[PDB]
Amino acid sequence: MYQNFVTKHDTAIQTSRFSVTGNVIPAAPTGNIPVINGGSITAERAVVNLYANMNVSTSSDGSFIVAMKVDTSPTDPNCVISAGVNLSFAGTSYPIVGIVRFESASEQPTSIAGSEVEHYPIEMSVGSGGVCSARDCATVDIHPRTSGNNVFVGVICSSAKWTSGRVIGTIATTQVIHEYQVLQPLK
Amino acid sequence: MYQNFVTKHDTAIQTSRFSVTGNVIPAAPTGNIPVINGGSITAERAVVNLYANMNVSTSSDGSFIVAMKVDTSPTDPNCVISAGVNLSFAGTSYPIVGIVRFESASEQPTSIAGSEVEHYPIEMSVGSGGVCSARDCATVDIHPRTSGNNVFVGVICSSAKWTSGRVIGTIATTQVIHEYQVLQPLK
Amino acid sequence: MYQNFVTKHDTAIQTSRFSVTGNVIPAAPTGNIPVINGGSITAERAVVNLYANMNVSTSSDGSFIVAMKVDTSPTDPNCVISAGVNLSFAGTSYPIVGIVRFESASEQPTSIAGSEVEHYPIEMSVGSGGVCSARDCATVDIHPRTSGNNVFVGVICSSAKWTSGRVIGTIATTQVIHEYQVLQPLK
Amino acid sequence: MYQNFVTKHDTAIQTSRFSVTGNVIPAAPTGNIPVINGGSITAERAVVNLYANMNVSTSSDGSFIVAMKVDTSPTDPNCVISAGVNLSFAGTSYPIVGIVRFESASEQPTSIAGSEVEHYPIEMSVGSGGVCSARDCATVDIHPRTSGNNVFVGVICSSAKWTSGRVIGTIATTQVIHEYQVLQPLK
Amino acid sequence: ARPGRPQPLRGTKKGARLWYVGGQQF
Amino acid sequence: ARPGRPQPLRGTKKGARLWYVGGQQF
Amino acid sequence: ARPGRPQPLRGTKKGARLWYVGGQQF
Amino acid sequence: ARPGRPQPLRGTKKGARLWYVGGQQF
Amino acid sequence: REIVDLSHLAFDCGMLGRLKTVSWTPVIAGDSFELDAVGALRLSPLRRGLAIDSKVDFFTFYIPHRHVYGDQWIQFMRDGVNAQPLPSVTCNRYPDHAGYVGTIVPANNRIPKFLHQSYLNIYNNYFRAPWMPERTEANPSNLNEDDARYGFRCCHLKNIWSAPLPPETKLAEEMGIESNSIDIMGLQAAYAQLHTEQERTYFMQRYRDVISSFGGSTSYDADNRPLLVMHTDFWASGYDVDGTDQSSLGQFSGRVQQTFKHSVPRFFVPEHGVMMTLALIRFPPISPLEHHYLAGKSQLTYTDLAGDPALIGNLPPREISYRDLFRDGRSGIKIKVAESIWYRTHPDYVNFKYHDLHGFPFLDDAPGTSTGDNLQEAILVRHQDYDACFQSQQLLQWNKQARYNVSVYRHMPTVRDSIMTS
Amino acid sequence: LIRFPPISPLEHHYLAGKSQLTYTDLAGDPALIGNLPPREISYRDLFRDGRSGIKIKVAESIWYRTHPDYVNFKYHDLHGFPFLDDAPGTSTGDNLQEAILVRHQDYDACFQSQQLLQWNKQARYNVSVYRHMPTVRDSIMTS
Amino acid sequence: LIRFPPISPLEHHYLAGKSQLTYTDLAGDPALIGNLPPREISYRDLFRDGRSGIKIKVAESIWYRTHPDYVNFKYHDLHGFPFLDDAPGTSTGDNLQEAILVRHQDYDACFQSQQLLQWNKQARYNVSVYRHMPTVRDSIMTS
DNA sequence: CAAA
DNA sequence: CAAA
DNA sequence: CAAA
DNA sequence: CAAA
């Protein structure tokens, strides 16, 4: 049949990749959320591979974030931001995802206050006990609301009841300001 | 590939946000359903963040609501109302969602009788034991059927068997009378 | 982004609503299936709210039906029939749904023999242990095959192993012979 | 109704099939991942049938791969690569899938280092305890980044906690450089 | 058989007066 | 080879009478 | 009733001077 | 204001010679 | 005497049956006003292809401020630079609630009376049925949601049921008789008298018409009536856009879109006032639910069918109900028609099948079927009757964009003369 | 320099704005119009949402020398028309100059996607210049 | 009255149908054609799926006075062409009249959606009638 | 259409 | 439009 | 544009 | 193109 060439999320190609291992310390919206990026992706297309241990040193119900620095060049008020996640947890905790936007004068944010995070729900492919999947996008104003900060976007992952255990998968996210060209056999 | 720019639900952008914590008292359709909004969103685009405890002080099988005040300016008989939810519960209860419409002379409804609520089913992204997800919409007549009331719409969340426990996520809903413009690289 | 205005099922608007409580007696295809409608929807758009107890007084594996009377005015051989269901059961039984067509000289069928029921499978949004969801449609010949009967359509719900317990949700179904007009901001 | 002729993945037709039995030794990204293909599909359309035992002789959390040799003839920078998987495991482990690209001067790779594998997330149809399903695609640069190697693509399957047990299903994957013609009744 | 490409129909419009209503009404 | 843009075919329509049916039938 | 196919409207443009602003301003 | 429907631009093309390169080069 | 260029463009829109102001210009005694409006008119996207054209009517009236402000104006003008400033009137606290008179409700929620009063006067002197209650609304705030924003409703295009005989039409004239005798000489006057009464009832309800009847005339200042300076009209046609995708292929949307000119010959403005120009779009009242009167009658009598002249000229009017004209005709709506009037006119036909087809501008519901047993309400155009056929009234039912070229000669110092002191 | 005529569904005729209509306004008496001083009015007097802190000095009865463009309010919130859906200089503050100069953001609203800013053009500039100029040969040749 | 010419991919030339071709058929000998009685044949003789119970009496060698329309079988099951993809009167029974009259269902097949039945039309009927008719005024006026 |  |  |  |  005819191959479908449209998609809610195009995963960055050869660039913007960072592997993250270690302990992921989920947190509650009342505190500061963990932004597991020290070498935070730039090109505003980010692919993050996960192979770490979901540790509950803090609260049992929280959320961690993966982010990227929004390119603000475009004069357009706002553009689309897509994400594509695939996470498999060991400890049944019924994960959950979505897209977020937050600012910070800091270039490489390590954590962001929950009262400083904006949410954008997205259709979750799946949300089983140990695996959340999703490939979707949302509309987000790309310009810094406070003269001075850098704008950040990414997918956030939460749970009502986390469970210590290894987590693995990929967290991809992109600011659509380019549609990847592709061999379409009939043109 | 080509980025998809259509979607069943556009989550409000910088405005219309309210965080709700505390106890959510689900109820049965025979009684009055809890409308967890005191500062009920106006612009008829609503984003509600949940970080509260699902308490069963009343019945074990019920439903709670998140709502917004419909803008009735449009002369069009009825417009589309989209919702995008992502809820993760601790207590396995197999959640469920949908869109609803109800009137009330009250500006900030605290609860609404079940026999006064209209249902509009929507494809649920997921409905696992502890996480319901959905991004869809439905057609709803936006004009007050009883000369005098204000029209309300929102997503309702129910369960056949609830279970005391923390719930977290986002409840977004919007009356489409505006499509957010967006940078489309090829135009 | 651009709001999507197409959909497999449009839930009836202000009309055709009936609430059903009590005991739902699932049955096997070898016997007569329970059509939980006494005041069976007419306009051939039906919305049915469920708040009853799934009782196994008969067999442990069966199915119940929700139906509506097909409008046969249209000279077109057959039209589309969409359904949108959201059911949350207490007793884990892995529900299942689909669309059905059956005739009967009776105006308000209370039950229909299984060997007299026609099936039309539909993509199930979800089919977890305690919640089935689906918003789809199918092509169905709308004219009475036996000179004299009335044609009925609706969604059927089955299970391989039911389990006594309260069930809640909505069963919507419509014969598409009208597409609801809607405010599309850009026209 | 009108039959849909578009699709994210077209499963190769009469060619490119290989059956794989035996022991699948999942591995961690810190080591070399198992590429269960000795007779690796060529035409860059691959269908692989699984009927083997998921054995944990190494680590409990890992991932195995199914791959194909990318045709590099096309002068187009990159083309679409679709995959369609259906795996049912015995041992509940919450599987997970995605598409990958990796090079190697070797014609028939038996295993590939994790730090040498590129990920491309895809909407997972399902990700239950014992069955992952997915039919999607992604954009991938088809030319060898290192003068000399052959380019490989395929679906990878991972888990946070594997569980010894038989696995069965099909792993299909194709490089879209041809859209299969098809009888469309109305043309 | 007339060549032209289909035109929408206009007014249902003569002899002497028909409508007496008390004066001029547009 | 004829220039024109494809036209749908009309009537299968002469000499003397063929159809006797008892009288006039349209 | 005018035949033509709808044209977008142009300038809101005469007698003597109206705008004194100190000199020439484009 | 020119009527015509937008045309793509062609060559950036005169007096005496400019490009000496050793001989003829196309 | 110099030219003042008041040319300006305008973008508007409104509901079907309602009369909207599209451009108002204040004038001064002595002004020579000329107006050439040109542009195009359209209707919100349709559901199906095009069915029929809408009749568009444009009007341009001139109203002396004296008609509005009354004797209070004569003083204003007389007292000159002393005169008690003219009072403004009130609108509701909403931007749009001034629409009917072509303007956004100003910052202070009050617009000049002449705009409001003129709109009334215009409406009462030309648009309402002479027998309907005269519109009297004091201020633009006594006006309801719909009216204030879209303009008052007007009458459907005249047909057998939309243009009946004034409801109070005499159906019999009684004359006093002694017990055994009758004054034939009185019976004489009796008839004559009736005549004068009918002449009036039928077509002389307005003072001017009565006078004109004697073969006289009446200044527009006599009964304080707006002056109709120019009235054009046309049919709005367009085209169908073809569907080209898998599911839309074979579908069509109608895009009504008609261009038009509305020219007003040089006009001499005798007294300070306003030049108001309003539009009115309507669809001919076609209904798949209407039938020929004769198909309705159950007992067909000679007096109906025969069409015998001797009778048709001497019988009294006939009282019939909408039931007699539509299948779902409201029986409580009684109209008095002229005998054998069904032989003087044929009704439009729409196969029932179009009954429930969303997209055609027909009256798929017997006129005034949701306003109750009230005739006037049935006769005036209910714009909701059309909500049905528009894909999306983002710009109401219709809308237009035109350029209003206006040239006015008037005694007016030059801006320089205004800003220069010495 | 590309510009759109400043049409606004929020502007009204000055006279519709005045609350107390005086002879000196309406009458249009010549004797007056030529001898009065200018008039100080605020944007409030011209737009419903007119910023009152913006004072402009106009010429008397200037509202009788010119008619303003009209846009039914309904176009107010319709994304797509190049109108000023917001009273001029409504987001620059009580600063006149800022209101008068064209704020290009006032238009972001109506464009589907400024991938090439608001406008853009492609043209060929044919230029011919006569001048004292040795030939390239003369430049590269020494002898 | 709208009709489609009765084209059928299932009809064949009478002569292609006859099994035993006789002189009296093929020859077309005048001497015979003018003196033989009519011929009783069945729809079977004209269509592959021709109902044999439908007997019609035709004139001799009438197949030499007229040629039948041809439709390659392939259009047989192609939804969309207004042909009779089923031998005339194939679902009305061995009743001739029923076969001869136009069964409109034979066409349901080719229309995407009879929302306005098979066909539909929109026209203006201009009618002018001269007649002895008092004027409406004369009707409403008594004196 | 009596192609009488 | 008094089709006076 | 001093519509000086 | 020796714009020799």
mmCIF file of N, CA, C and O in Angstrom, chain A residues 59-83:
data_model
loop_
_atom_site.group_PDB
_atom_site.id
_atom_site.type_symbol
_atom_site.label_atom_id
_atom_site.label_comp_id
_atom_site.label_asym_id
_atom_site.label_seq_id
_atom_site.Cartn_x
_atom_site.Cartn_y
_atom_site.Cartn_z
ATOM 1 N N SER A 59 10.629 11.351 47.880
ATOM 2 C CA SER A 59 9.236 10.929 47.997
ATOM 3 C C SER A 59 8.926 9.738 47.097
ATOM 4 O O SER A 59 9.640 9.474 46.128
ATOM 5 N N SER A 60 7.857 9.024 47.434
ATOM 6 C CA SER A 60 7.431 7.841 46.692
ATOM 7 C C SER A 60 6.617 8.181 45.448
ATOM 8 O O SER A 60 6.487 7.363 44.537
ATOM 9 N N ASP A 61 6.068 9.392 45.417
ATOM 10 C CA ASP A 61 5.271 9.850 44.284
ATOM 11 C C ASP A 61 5.897 11.129 43.744
ATOM 12 O O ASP A 61 5.937 12.148 44.433
ATOM 13 N N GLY A 62 6.403 11.077 42.516
ATOM 14 C CA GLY A 62 7.034 12.255 41.957
ATOM 15 C C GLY A 62 7.057 12.355 40.447
ATOM 16 O O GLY A 62 6.081 12.013 39.778
ATOM 17 N N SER A 63 8.189 12.827 39.922
ATOM 18 C CA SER A 63 8.382 13.014 38.485
ATOM 19 C C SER A 63 9.772 13.554 38.123
ATOM 20 O O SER A 63 10.327 14.397 38.820
ATOM 21 N N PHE A 64 10.338 13.055 37.030
ATOM 22 C CA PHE A 64 11.639 13.539 36.582
ATOM 23 C C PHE A 64 11.473 14.091 35.171
ATOM 24 O O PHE A 64 10.523 13.747 34.464
ATOM 25 N N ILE A 65 12.412 14.935 34.764
ATOM 26 C CA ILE A 65 12.344 15.586 33.467
ATOM 27 C C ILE A 65 13.557 15.398 32.565
ATOM 28 O O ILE A 65 14.673 15.177 33.042
ATOM 29 N N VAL A 66 13.313 15.478 31.256
ATOM 30 C CA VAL A 66 14.373 15.411 30.246
ATOM 31 C C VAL A 66 14.080 16.670 29.450
ATOM 32 O O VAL A 66 12.939 16.868 29.030
ATOM 33 N N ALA A 67 15.081 17.519 29.239
ATOM 34 C CA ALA A 67 14.820 18.756 28.516
ATOM 35 C C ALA A 67 15.818 19.176 27.450
ATOM 36 O O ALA A 67 16.901 18.597 27.310
ATOM 37 N N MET A 68 15.415 20.195 26.694
ATOM 38 C CA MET A 68 16.246 20.787 25.651
ATOM 39 C C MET A 68 16.024 22.305 25.571
ATOM 40 O O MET A 68 14.963 22.822 25.955
ATOM 41 N N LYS A 69 17.050 23.012 25.099
ATOM 42 C CA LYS A 69 17.013 24.466 24.975
ATOM 43 C C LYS A 69 16.355 24.898 23.673
ATOM 44 O O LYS A 69 16.893 24.649 22.598
ATOM 45 N N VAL A 70 15.203 25.554 23.773
ATOM 46 C CA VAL A 70 14.453 26.018 22.604
ATOM 47 C C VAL A 70 15.176 27.064 21.769
ATOM 48 O O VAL A 70 15.695 28.050 22.309
ATOM 49 N N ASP A 71 15.202 26.857 20.453
ATOM 50 C CA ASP A 71 15.836 27.821 19.560
ATOM 51 C C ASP A 71 14.820 28.927 19.432
ATOM 52 O O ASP A 71 13.677 28.680 19.053
ATOM 53 N N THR A 72 15.228 30.146 19.743
ATOM 54 C CA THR A 72 14.308 31.266 19.687
ATOM 55 C C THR A 72 14.428 32.155 18.451
ATOM 56 O O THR A 72 13.767 33.194 18.360
ATOM 57 N N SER A 73 15.262 31.746 17.500
ATOM 58 C CA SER A 73 15.459 32.510 16.270
ATOM 59 C C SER A 73 14.138 32.854 15.568
ATOM 60 O O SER A 73 13.844 34.029 15.339
ATOM 61 N N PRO A 74 13.314 31.835 15.242
ATOM 62 C CA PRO A 74 12.021 31.994 14.560
ATOM 63 C C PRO A 74 11.191 33.163 15.066
ATOM 64 O O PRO A 74 10.989 33.294 16.272
ATOM 65 N N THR A 75 10.702 34.001 14.150
ATOM 66 C CA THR A 75 9.887 35.153 14.540
ATOM 67 C C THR A 75 8.451 34.723 14.818
ATOM 68 O O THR A 75 7.658 35.489 15.376
ATOM 69 N N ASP A 76 8.130 33.497 14.410
ATOM 70 C CA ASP A 76 6.807 32.925 14.622
ATOM 71 C C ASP A 76 6.599 32.899 16.126
ATOM 72 O O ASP A 76 7.507 32.537 16.869
ATOM 73 N N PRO A 77 5.402 33.274 16.595
ATOM 74 C CA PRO A 77 5.082 33.302 18.024
ATOM 75 C C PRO A 77 5.367 31.983 18.736
ATOM 76 O O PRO A 77 5.969 31.953 19.820
ATOM 77 N N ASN A 78 4.942 30.889 18.121
ATOM 78 C CA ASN A 78 5.158 29.587 18.716
ATOM 79 C C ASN A 78 5.147 28.491 17.674
ATOM 80 O O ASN A 78 4.486 28.626 16.637
ATOM 81 N N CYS A 79 5.903 27.425 17.943
ATOM 82 C CA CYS A 79 5.963 26.270 17.044
ATOM 83 C C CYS A 79 5.670 24.954 17.760
ATOM 84 O O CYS A 79 5.504 24.909 18.979
ATOM 85 N N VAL A 80 5.588 23.884 16.984
ATOM 86 C CA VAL A 80 5.273 22.586 17.542
ATOM 87 C C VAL A 80 6.490 21.906 18.160
ATOM 88 O O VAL A 80 7.622 22.078 17.702
ATOM 89 N N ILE A 81 6.240 21.154 19.227
ATOM 90 C CA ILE A 81 7.277 20.421 19.937
ATOM 91 C C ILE A 81 6.775 18.998 20.120
ATOM 92 O O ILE A 81 5.782 18.753 20.812
ATOM 93 N N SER A 82 7.462 18.063 19.475
ATOM 94 C CA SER A 82 7.076 16.663 19.527
ATOM 95 C C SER A 82 7.994 15.869 20.417
ATOM 96 O O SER A 82 9.154 16.232 20.617
ATOM 97 N N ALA A 83 7.462 14.777 20.949
ATOM 98 C CA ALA A 83 8.225 13.906 21.817
ATOM 99 C C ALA A 83 7.876 12.468 21.482
ATOM 100 O O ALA A 83 6.768 12.171 21.031
#
